[PDB]
Amino acid sequence: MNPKRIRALKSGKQGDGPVVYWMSRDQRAEDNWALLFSRAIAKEANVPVVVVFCLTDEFLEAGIRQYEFMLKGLQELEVSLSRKKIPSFFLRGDPGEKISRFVKDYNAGTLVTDFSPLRIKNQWIEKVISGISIPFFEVDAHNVVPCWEASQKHEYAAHTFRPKLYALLPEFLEEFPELEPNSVTPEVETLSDVLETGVKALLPERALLKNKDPLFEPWHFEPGEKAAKKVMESFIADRLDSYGALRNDPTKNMLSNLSPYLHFGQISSQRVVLEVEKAESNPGSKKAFLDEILIWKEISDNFCYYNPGYDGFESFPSWAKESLNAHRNDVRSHIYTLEEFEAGKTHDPLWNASQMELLSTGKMHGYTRMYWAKKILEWSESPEKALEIAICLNDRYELDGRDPNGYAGIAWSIGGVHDRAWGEREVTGKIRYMSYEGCKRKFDVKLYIEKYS
Numbered sequence: 001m002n003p004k005r006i007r008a009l010k011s012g013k014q015g016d017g018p019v020v021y022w023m024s025r026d027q028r029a030e031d032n033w034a035l036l037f038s039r040a041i042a043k044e045a046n047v048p049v050v051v052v053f054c055l056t057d058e059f060l061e062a063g064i065r066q067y068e069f070m071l072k073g074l075q076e077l078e079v080s081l082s083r084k085k086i087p088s089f090f091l092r093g094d095p096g097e098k099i100s101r102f103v104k105d106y107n108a109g110t111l112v113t114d115f116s117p118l119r120i121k122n123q124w125i126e127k128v129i130s131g132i133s134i135p136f137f138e139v140d141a142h143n144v145v146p147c148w149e150a151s152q153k154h155e156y157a158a159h160t161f162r163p164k165l166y167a168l169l170p171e172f173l174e175e176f177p178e179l180e181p182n183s184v185t186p187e188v189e190t191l192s193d194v195l196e197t198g199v200k201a202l203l204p205e206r207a208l209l210k211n212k213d214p215l216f217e218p219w220h221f222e223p224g225e226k227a228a229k230k231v232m233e234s235f236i237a238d239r240l241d242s243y244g245a246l247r248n249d250p251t252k253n254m255l256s257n258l259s260p261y262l263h264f265g266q267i268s269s270q271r272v273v274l275e276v277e278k279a280e281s282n283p284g285s286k287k288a289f290l291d292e293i294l295i296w297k298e299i300s301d302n303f304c305y306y307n308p309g310y311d312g313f314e315s316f317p318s319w320a321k322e323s324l325n326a327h328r329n330d331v332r333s334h335i336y337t338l339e340e341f342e343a344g345k346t347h348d349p350l351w352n353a354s355q356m357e358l359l360s361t362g363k364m365h366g367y368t369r370m371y372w373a374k375k376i377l378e379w380s381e382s383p384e385k386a387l388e389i390a391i392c393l394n395d396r397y398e399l400d401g402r403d404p405n406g407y408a409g410i411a412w413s414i415g416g417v418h419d420r421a422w423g424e425r426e427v428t429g430k431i432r433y434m435s436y437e438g439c440k441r442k443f444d445v446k447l448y449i450e451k452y453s
């Protein structure tokens with residue numbers, strides 16, 4: 001086990017109780033560096049391990065589509081962790097008040113959590129640190145290369161972060177050891193009841209159409225660790241050979257569809273990369289997929305980790321802030337409100353059909369995710385309003401929302417983060433522009449619109 005994956009958040013006197021794993025971002029039992037590191041520490045202290053998840057008060061800021069997908073994967077996770085004599089405890093409330101209470105009530109010896117560069121996770125760590133006296137560690141179980149190890153600063157481009165990650169791949173890209181079960185079983189409600197009351201609280205804000213029927217379709221992505229692997233195997237055997245040539249065509253189902261499992265941590269990217277590297281296929285398709293799950297996925301964590309204002313206008317590059325400021329007073333072609341963007345009531349049918357795919361499936365195609373956010377910048381009163389509208393609609397309706405990938409993907413489309421300067425236009429400035437005629441020359445836009453009426 002590599003010691004460069006674990007960081008120390010607070011020193012203190014070790015207790016004589018079970019080692020607590022505060023699971024948050026990585027909700028899986030297999031291939032979860034934070035969970036094996038909690039097991040070896042407890043094996044060294046002659047004590048068992050205990051998994052603790054917190055059902056926060058911010059679950060209503062999203063929708064039912066994310067509340068059911070996450071909880072249904074935990075019901076499978078609770079059954080999974082029990083076979084290895086690893087009990088799980090699901091607390092409801094503020095993590096700062098619940099984790100600090102569980103540590104004192106259960107006489108915890110060492111607290112361990114997974115890594116997440118989001119601001120809400122740093123808020124929980126600050127309150128938890130102030131209420132505990134036991135050692136507190138964090139382990140990067142989401143990236144193949146630890147976020148603090150791949151680079152010591154913010155990388156402004158993908159071509160300057162690529163040789164750093166690939167140079168550290170031979171050391172960190174490795175096979176996972178088997179999770180050892182607890183020697184003996186050690187010494188706050190059912191997840192079905194917490195799902196029934198939570199869905200009841202989210203029902204008045206459900207996404208409906210005019211016929212009062214729900215818009216979300218839950219049969220597109222089944223949640224769980226078992227379903228995550230079956231999607232990975234189907235992509236390797238059916239979709240990866242044609243990925244490099246059909247990844248920018250939204251009319252084809254050629255993407256791996258692993259982001260709802262990668263966001264909630266139901267499948268490990270290191271596990272997918274290991275299966276991808278050992279699969280024989282198109283080298284241009286393998287290179288394109290690894291560039292998406294290794295470079296662009298972990299550079300998003302690098303963005304949110306080294307930029308406190310990753311969701312603001314101040315984190316944009318200097319050339320983009322100067323260009324957007326010189327094109328702010330430009331008369332926009334159209335100005336729609338957040339409700340018109342949410343209901344897909346724009347003059348552009350491609351943007352509306354893209355929004356409908358987001359409303360109905362919860363996972364908009366990767367190429368249309370570019371056109372969807374850039375048109376928000378073109379049809380907003382300011383770049384800041386375009387940031388607020390894009391983030392709100394992205395985090396509310398996307399299954400993989402509230403993730404550093406979306407914040408870095410939105411900052412690319414509006415602020416040009418990890419991009420370069422293009423031809424200067426009005427309103428948008430030197431930000432890369434995607435037109436409706438350009439997408440017609442790339443894929444059948446009529447088929448993508450007719451599919452999402």
Ligand SMILES: Cc1cc2nc3c(=O)[nH]c(=O)nc-3n(C[C@H](O)[C@H](O)[C@H](O)COP(=O)(O)OP(=O)(O)OC[C@H]3O[C@@H](n4cnc5c(N)ncnc54)[C@H](O)[C@@H]3O)c2cc1C
Nearest residue numbers: 255256257258259292293297366373398400401405406409
């Ligand atoms: C405006 C906008 C909004 C986005 N919204 C989200 C979001 O809410 N949540 C989210 O996790 N990602 C988001 N992305 C990134 C990207 O769209 C998705 O990661 C990708 O589409 C996920 O679907 P997939 O698994 O079928 O893609 P695949 O082609 O199968 O790629 C597999 C994995 O590689 C990673 N990856 C691929 N493309 C990107 C990318 N452009 N950026 C970061 N990682 C990538 C993802 O982890 C992805 O799961 C967004 C990008 C933009 C420009």
